[PDB]
Amino acid sequence: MKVSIPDFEKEGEGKSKHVMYKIKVKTGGEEWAVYRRYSDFYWLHKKLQQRYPELVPELPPKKWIYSALDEQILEKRKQGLEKYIQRIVSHPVLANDELVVSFLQA
């Protein structure tokens, strides 16, 4: 399983600016995308860390981000979340964990 995060996207209203990260997932000759917020990654991390504290990599940190205004902050978070999820899928045991399978397919 090969994963990457080519882009982030802002979805919603104007008052509920939320940022979602587009995760591109390849396995065999199949490819699809899922969209996930930082808070989705944070929940995944906390639950995985309970199961496999030895294997879970460092998650990019929580931040006060004003209005999602700062794209420079978002580009760095995108990059960090990409390294994070790549590291997860590099461990067969995590890649096959039901949480991760759901995270990457739902």
Structure description:
This protein has helices spanning 38-51, 71-89, 92-95, 98-105, and strands at residues 2-11, 18-27, 30-37. A hairpin with a 6-residue loop joins strand 1 (2-11) and strand 2. Strands 1-2-3 form a 3-stranded antiparallel sheet. The chain contains 4 helices and 3 strands. Helices cover 42% and strands 26% of the residues. It has a single domain (1-106), classed as PX Domain, CATH 3.30.1520.
CATH top-level class: Alpha Beta
- Would you list the SSEs in sequence order as H and E? EEEHHHH
CATH architecture: 2-Layer Sandwich
CATH superfamily: Phox-like domain
Number of strands: 3
Taken as a percent bin, the fraction of beta residues is 25-35%
Derived structural class: alpha+beta
Q: Order of strands across the biggest sheet?
A: 1-2-3
The total tally of domains equals: 1
If you compute it from the alpha carbons, what radius of gyration comes out, rounded to the nearest whole angstrom?
14 Å
Indicate the percent of residues in helices: 40-55%
* Shape label: globular
* Main sheet attributes: strand count, strand direction, barrel closure: 3 strands, antiparallel
Distance between the termini: 16 Å
- CATH fold name: PX Domain
Count up the helices.
Answer: 4
Topology (elements, then pairings):
Blueprint: E1 2-11, E2 18-27, E3 30-37, H1 38-51, H2 71-89, H3 92-95, H4 98-105
Antiparallel strand pairs: 1-2, 2-3
PDB class: de novo protein
Keywords: EvoDesign, Computational Protein Design, DE novo protein
Assembly: monomeric
